[PDB]
Amino acid sequence: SNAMIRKYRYGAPFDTEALTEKIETAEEAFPYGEISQKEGFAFTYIMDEDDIVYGLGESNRGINKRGYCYISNCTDDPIHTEDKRSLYGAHNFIIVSGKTTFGLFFDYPSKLTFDIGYTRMDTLKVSCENADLDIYVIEGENAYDIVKQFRRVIGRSYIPPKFAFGFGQSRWGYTTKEDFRAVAKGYRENHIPIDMIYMDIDYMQDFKDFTVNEKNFPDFPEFVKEMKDQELRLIPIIDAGVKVEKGYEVYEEGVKNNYFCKREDGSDFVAAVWPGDTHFPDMLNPEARKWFGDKYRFLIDQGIEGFWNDMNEPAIFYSSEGLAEAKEFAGEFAKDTEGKIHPWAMQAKMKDIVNSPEDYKRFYHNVNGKKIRHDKVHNLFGYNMTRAAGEAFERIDPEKRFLMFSRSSYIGMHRYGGIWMGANKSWWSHILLNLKMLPSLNMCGFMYTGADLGGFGDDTTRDLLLRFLALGVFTPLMRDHAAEGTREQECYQFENIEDFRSVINARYRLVPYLYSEYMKAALNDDMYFKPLGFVYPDDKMAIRVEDQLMLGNEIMIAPVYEQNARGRYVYLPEEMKFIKFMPDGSISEEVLEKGVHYVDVALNEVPLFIRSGKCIPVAEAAECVKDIDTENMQLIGYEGSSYTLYEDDGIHKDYDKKENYRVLTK
Amino acid sequence: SNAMIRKYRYGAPFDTEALTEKIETAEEAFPYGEISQKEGFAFTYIMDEDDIVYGLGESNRGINKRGYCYISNCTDDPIHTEDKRSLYGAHNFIIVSGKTTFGLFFDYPSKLTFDIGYTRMDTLKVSCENADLDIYVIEGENAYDIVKQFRRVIGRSYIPPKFAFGFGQSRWGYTTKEDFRAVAKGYRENHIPIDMIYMDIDYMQDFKDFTVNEKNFPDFPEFVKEMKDQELRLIPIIDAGVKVEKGYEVYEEGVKNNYFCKREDGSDFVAAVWPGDTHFPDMLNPEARKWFGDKYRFLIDQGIEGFWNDMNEPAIFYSSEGLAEAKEFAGEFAKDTEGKIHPWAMQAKMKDIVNSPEDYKRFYHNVNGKKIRHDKVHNLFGYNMTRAAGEAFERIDPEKRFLMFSRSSYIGMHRYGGIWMGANKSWWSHILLNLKMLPSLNMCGFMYTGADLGGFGDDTTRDLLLRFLALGVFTPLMRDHAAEGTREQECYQFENIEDFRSVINARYRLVPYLYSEYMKAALNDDMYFKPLGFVYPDDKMAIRVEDQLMLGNEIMIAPVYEQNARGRYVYLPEEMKFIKFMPDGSISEEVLEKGVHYVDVALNEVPLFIRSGKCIPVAEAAECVKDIDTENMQLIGYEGSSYTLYEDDGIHKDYDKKENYRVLTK
């Protein structure tokens, strides 16, 4: 089809500000399927048997979304299993790809249900409670063309500083300078590369946003510099909830200036999170956003160059109302002698007060003099928290890139920060799940992304971490961050440390190439990771591959994701050079023809494939991003090919200089 | 190595009667690794890097058990996640396979921990609280030889009646005659093959074992006949817990004759399950065992020819003690004004009263006057419940085979019934899990096995059901039994029901072959399913394949287990004929050479591979086992090959007759 984007408006949509490009309202009949405004809103479309459905960004299941139900409803779940319908992100863009091909973006800020062949195999049904939304229809040559059009109108993706393409580490539990010093020493003295150490909630004073524990960090700026002098940048977490505490300045200011979300009666809503009772900044109120974002100056002025935003669905352990209800019910259960209240009913009530739909109807946002109940705009919360930070960085230092990523998100947030897929338990299934999400995230603007393995208890075995890190080599966010209750030993503490050094070395050897492809893609509103079907649209086998990805225009990745495996099957849609980074520092190469192959990949080997007629630069291993030698890089791949390398200072925003680009020829 | 079996005795083991062959106590030092009795019992062994560890029957993870922790401790968990350490069965047989190869059976009836490279990759450690156990060491030239020796000493596996090789259907909520009549009608009017309909707990009078609801089934024997006249055999469930109810004969007899498990003070221990308060029959008390098993006559005399035993870990929703503790805790939570008792602690207490280790220490078995605390022999409960039934069948009708399978088990129970792998979710990952478990189950004597999907609502999508059934085609227990909180998932309830009919037709066409292989294996203490490494021991690639299985000596299976997939990769260790049962009743054939292939398999096609120089008989599709025409079967496979068909009357036990064997030549 001829490229076209049209916007169909229903009712009176809340302005989410997802798009940067203004699309005029289309007046003509809606061009695909059927629209009903009877029971709220529903779009219904009958798919052809061969149709593939792409999109939904951070959502469960596979690259082809057919065959299940997905609900856009920012949610933090304890475990990511196959039946979960909602993850942390609400990314309402889908592309139907087949004989009839088109994209749809449903710009709607509340619970949106995508029944993608779940109820009836041939039926796509997208529904929500109120017909107040904009639907963008995108037409084009194919799915990839449709994605590129969408990427244009949602505005340029967030771009991290180059140090963020290094490796990072963190543990929920690091509290003192001494803990951080031991990690720094463990990596540097064992020559494992690293650029970042993440600080979890224990660095704060009693879990208070925009404080540092003064007992532990009396001289925090000096410690920040101590780490930075060793090319270790500390990246502190910020939470959505601001502790209720008299005399705490962030709390006092929020109360005085009405910057917190309020109950129906205008009192400040209380949600318990890590600090106990908290209030939530009204992320949808521009004045509150400016105030909250400006608080980041507290840490930036101490030498911090990156942040991560958490618990921003927002998470609620319980509300004052929910806790009271639960205690009342517990009292009834305690006194019940007639078998009225079953133990499982008691258990359910306790589970029900966590992230409760009832609580999301108990507080409001103040948006242009109007109070809007939170549930009606729930999916915008994390988005606007991260927007608050991003906009504050632009005011503080317009020309500087800060590392920034968020748990919850909605399209539009992709301009301000990346995302990470969190986890609690260490599962093999996490590897494939995260691989599959990558292209979908890219379709929706989120290019700086990565995942956590889990880390709880002793469940992270050596081989699981090694395979997880070998996927991480390619994801812009690559870190080993372990969750609460972790007893995960450090990379330098596992048996045969050289294997970990090998995998992380591979990341650093690839940084110039990966950074270059990230920059070329971000600056041109293109994808960093692509499904095979976007690159080989005429190959019926290629279009259905879900456990391999194309990266940039030069390579294909295919990580091993099965325990005890010494290799895996791949499909090559053209001739490629199969490359492995070896634990002795060498790079092995084998030419493989188009077709099916089984390739050997040891735990301490990192594989990739270089496409026919392409090459990539590979640096010698270095232990931090600053020390990578990009003057003397070898070119791996096909004789006679060339590669355009993007390289800037990695710090500022001087993107449009011709000097940033140089052609390398093998 | 030269075949041999030695028994090493530690302490004063409880006699589990797992082995039928008596082995003398060896007096030499333990032949492999090291044994410690410093703190309970521990066996520690250093594995070679290439060693594969087989075994553990019904356990999590893969065929090669290396890289995780497994605890033998019969348990019913709400969700079978990849991190779970214990399933329903405790099958303490492992084989280390490599440069040095040997098998070990740990005959110990309590919590047994297998740390198989979980803590340290090269270390196998098996441990338990008390050094009172027998350890059998089995030597042989290879893992398969070692398995065959083990199968000899544990005694011949349970053999089902031939009707049990048909297809079965059930739903938790079937309650009335009309419920069952609708199933009979739906299947038979649509020419969908079927032999069995399962009866879940609603057929009883108020969940009372060995009753039938007389309002719903006024003349049950007449109804059983109504069904049997249409070749539908009703298969009723029996639970471990006998309802506490005055006037209920099973309860009154148990109380009067001290046939229930008692608390320390001699009172009958109370456990809540489906009927509310129940007592558990004392399965280790020989008189109580005989009494409980004899109760099956109630149903046998009414025309019932099969049973399934459930909740027999035994499951406990709560005990009287646990409930009282939970209520006390709840009272404290309710009155807490200082926030000392957190809601998650309340939630945890509620969770903790279900299947509680503390409850398993509260009741005892009386074995000839010797009182044994249940936890010390926990893994023997389900085994002995099923033994009770099996021994009663032998007294009631020695010449007749009954269908019998059980949820919980221990080696030794394999002589008396099969097992099924239940579930509370409908996950694609459970297809692969169940596939991988099959050979391990066969190693431990359990050949009559199969699995369920158990998701709620409409979470079992049409395509998942079809792929699940396509694995089921090959598993001796093949049924579609759906949970309570679920849509109706009968094969005649989906859009294009021909697809379901096609898959079940494939089963029936294969019944003569599958039954023949089952009988030959059972009668010769051999495996029905085998890992590829057992058949192609010299092929380094074959030995590590985990998502294909060999069946008998003729075929290989390789089910598709990925959503939206139209085919899958396979490795063929020799030339084979790739065949597919097609929806039009045809059978496609293609010769494929040794090596790697991607094969196309549609949702409504059932694939298998016939080995070079082999053939199998394939019958025309029939709608019940009785109607299968075995006189005029096709031979599919290689010209010049032969197949020996075992066929008997399928009802009695006349196995040792030359006339049971017929040689077919293609």
PDB file of N, CA and C in Angstrom, chain A residues 633-663:
ATOM      1  N   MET A 633      40.842  -1.567  15.050  1.00  0.00           N
ATOM      2  CA  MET A 633      39.855  -2.633  15.105  1.00  0.00           C
ATOM      3  C   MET A 633      39.973  -3.530  13.892  1.00  0.00           C
ATOM      4  N   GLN A 634      39.799  -4.825  14.103  1.00  0.00           N
ATOM      5  CA  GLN A 634      39.823  -5.739  12.981  1.00  0.00           C
ATOM      6  C   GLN A 634      38.434  -5.805  12.378  1.00  0.00           C
ATOM      7  N   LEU A 635      38.374  -6.056  11.084  1.00  0.00           N
ATOM      8  CA  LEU A 635      37.091  -6.228  10.420  1.00  0.00           C
ATOM      9  C   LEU A 635      36.865  -7.698  10.178  1.00  0.00           C
ATOM     10  N   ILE A 636      35.740  -8.197  10.678  1.00  0.00           N
ATOM     11  CA  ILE A 636      35.372  -9.591  10.510  1.00  0.00           C
ATOM     12  C   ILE A 636      34.198  -9.677   9.553  1.00  0.00           C
ATOM     13  N   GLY A 637      34.243 -10.641   8.641  1.00  0.00           N
ATOM     14  CA  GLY A 637      33.174 -10.785   7.670  1.00  0.00           C
ATOM     15  C   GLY A 637      33.668 -11.043   6.264  1.00  0.00           C
ATOM     16  N   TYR A 638      32.977 -10.459   5.289  1.00  0.00           N
ATOM     17  CA  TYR A 638      33.228 -10.751   3.880  1.00  0.00           C
ATOM     18  C   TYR A 638      34.220  -9.818   3.202  1.00  0.00           C
ATOM     19  N   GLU A 639      35.169 -10.408   2.485  1.00  0.00           N
ATOM     20  CA  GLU A 639      36.131  -9.634   1.711  1.00  0.00           C
ATOM     21  C   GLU A 639      35.410  -8.694   0.759  1.00  0.00           C
ATOM     22  N   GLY A 640      35.915  -7.469   0.654  1.00  0.00           N
ATOM     23  CA  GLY A 640      35.372  -6.493  -0.274  1.00  0.00           C
ATOM     24  C   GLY A 640      34.211  -5.673   0.263  1.00  0.00           C
ATOM     25  N   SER A 641      33.694  -6.046   1.430  1.00  0.00           N
ATOM     26  CA  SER A 641      32.552  -5.330   1.992  1.00  0.00           C
ATOM     27  C   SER A 641      33.012  -4.105   2.773  1.00  0.00           C
ATOM     28  N   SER A 642      32.070  -3.221   3.060  1.00  0.00           N
ATOM     29  CA  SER A 642      32.372  -2.039   3.849  1.00  0.00           C
ATOM     30  C   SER A 642      31.379  -1.892   4.989  1.00  0.00           C
ATOM     31  N   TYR A 643      31.759  -1.096   5.978  1.00  0.00           N
ATOM     32  CA  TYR A 643      30.895  -0.831   7.122  1.00  0.00           C
ATOM     33  C   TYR A 643      30.999   0.644   7.493  1.00  0.00           C
ATOM     34  N   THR A 644      29.862   1.302   7.652  1.00  0.00           N
ATOM     35  CA  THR A 644      29.878   2.685   8.109  1.00  0.00           C
ATOM     36  C   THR A 644      29.770   2.755   9.635  1.00  0.00           C
ATOM     37  N   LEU A 645      30.860   3.185  10.261  1.00  0.00           N
ATOM     38  CA  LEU A 645      30.951   3.287  11.708  1.00  0.00           C
ATOM     39  C   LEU A 645      30.519   4.660  12.207  1.00  0.00           C
ATOM     40  N   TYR A 646      29.540   4.681  13.107  1.00  0.00           N
ATOM     41  CA  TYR A 646      29.190   5.899  13.825  1.00  0.00           C
ATOM     42  C   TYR A 646      29.971   5.940  15.126  1.00  0.00           C
ATOM     43  N   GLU A 647      30.661   7.053  15.358  1.00  0.00           N
ATOM     44  CA  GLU A 647      31.378   7.241  16.603  1.00  0.00           C
ATOM     45  C   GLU A 647      31.401   8.717  16.954  1.00  0.00           C
ATOM     46  N   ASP A 648      30.906   9.045  18.141  1.00  0.00           N
ATOM     47  CA  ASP A 648      30.981  10.407  18.671  1.00  0.00           C
ATOM     48  C   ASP A 648      31.640  10.374  20.057  1.00  0.00           C
ATOM     49  N   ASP A 649      31.547  11.457  20.824  1.00  0.00           N
ATOM     50  CA  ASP A 649      32.213  11.458  22.126  1.00  0.00           C
ATOM     51  C   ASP A 649      31.488  10.643  23.199  1.00  0.00           C
ATOM     52  N   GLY A 650      30.278  10.193  22.871  1.00  0.00           N
ATOM     53  CA  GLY A 650      29.512   9.329  23.748  1.00  0.00           C
ATOM     54  C   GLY A 650      28.877  10.031  24.931  1.00  0.00           C
ATOM     55  N   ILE A 651      29.102  11.337  25.030  1.00  0.00           N
ATOM     56  CA  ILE A 651      28.733  12.108  26.207  1.00  0.00           C
ATOM     57  C   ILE A 651      27.668  13.152  25.907  1.00  0.00           C
ATOM     58  N   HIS A 652      27.857  13.888  24.814  1.00  0.00           N
ATOM     59  CA  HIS A 652      26.985  15.010  24.498  1.00  0.00           C
ATOM     60  C   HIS A 652      26.010  14.652  23.386  1.00  0.00           C
ATOM     61  N   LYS A 653      25.421  15.653  22.743  1.00  0.00           N
ATOM     62  CA  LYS A 653      24.388  15.383  21.747  1.00  0.00           C
ATOM     63  C   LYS A 653      24.713  15.955  20.370  1.00  0.00           C
ATOM     64  N   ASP A 654      25.982  15.866  19.986  1.00  0.00           N
ATOM     65  CA  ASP A 654      26.457  16.449  18.730  1.00  0.00           C
ATOM     66  C   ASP A 654      26.368  15.383  17.641  1.00  0.00           C
ATOM     67  N   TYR A 655      25.138  15.010  17.311  1.00  0.00           N
ATOM     68  CA  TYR A 655      24.872  13.823  16.500  1.00  0.00           C
ATOM     69  C   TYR A 655      25.062  14.039  14.999  1.00  0.00           C
ATOM     70  N   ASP A 656      24.836  15.267  14.548  1.00  0.00           N
ATOM     71  CA  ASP A 656      24.776  15.565  13.118  1.00  0.00           C
ATOM     72  C   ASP A 656      26.061  16.206  12.605  1.00  0.00           C
ATOM     73  N   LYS A 657      27.192  15.593  12.931  1.00  0.00           N
ATOM     74  CA  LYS A 657      28.477  15.986  12.364  1.00  0.00           C
ATOM     75  C   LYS A 657      28.939  14.907  11.401  1.00  0.00           C
ATOM     76  N   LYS A 658      29.405  15.313  10.224  1.00  0.00           N
ATOM     77  CA  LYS A 658      29.852  14.346   9.234  1.00  0.00           C
ATOM     78  C   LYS A 658      31.039  13.546   9.769  1.00  0.00           C
ATOM     79  N   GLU A 659      31.806  14.152  10.671  1.00  0.00           N
ATOM     80  CA  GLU A 659      32.975  13.500  11.259  1.00  0.00           C
ATOM     81  C   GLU A 659      32.608  12.297  12.142  1.00  0.00           C
ATOM     82  N   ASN A 660      31.335  12.194  12.515  1.00  0.00           N
ATOM     83  CA  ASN A 660      30.873  11.064  13.322  1.00  0.00           C
ATOM     84  C   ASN A 660      30.828   9.773  12.518  1.00  0.00           C
ATOM     85  N   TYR A 661      30.894   9.879  11.193  1.00  0.00           N
ATOM     86  CA  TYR A 661      30.767   8.704  10.337  1.00  0.00           C
ATOM     87  C   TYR A 661      32.043   8.441   9.565  1.00  0.00           C
ATOM     88  N   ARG A 662      32.533   7.210   9.606  1.00  0.00           N
ATOM     89  CA  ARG A 662      33.634   6.841   8.730  1.00  0.00           C
ATOM     90  C   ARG A 662      33.465   5.432   8.179  1.00  0.00           C
ATOM     91  N   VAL A 663      33.816   5.277   6.910  1.00  0.00           N
ATOM     92  CA  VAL A 663      33.651   4.017   6.209  1.00  0.00           C
ATOM     93  C   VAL A 663      34.875   3.148   6.410  1.00  0.00           C
TER      94      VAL A 663
END
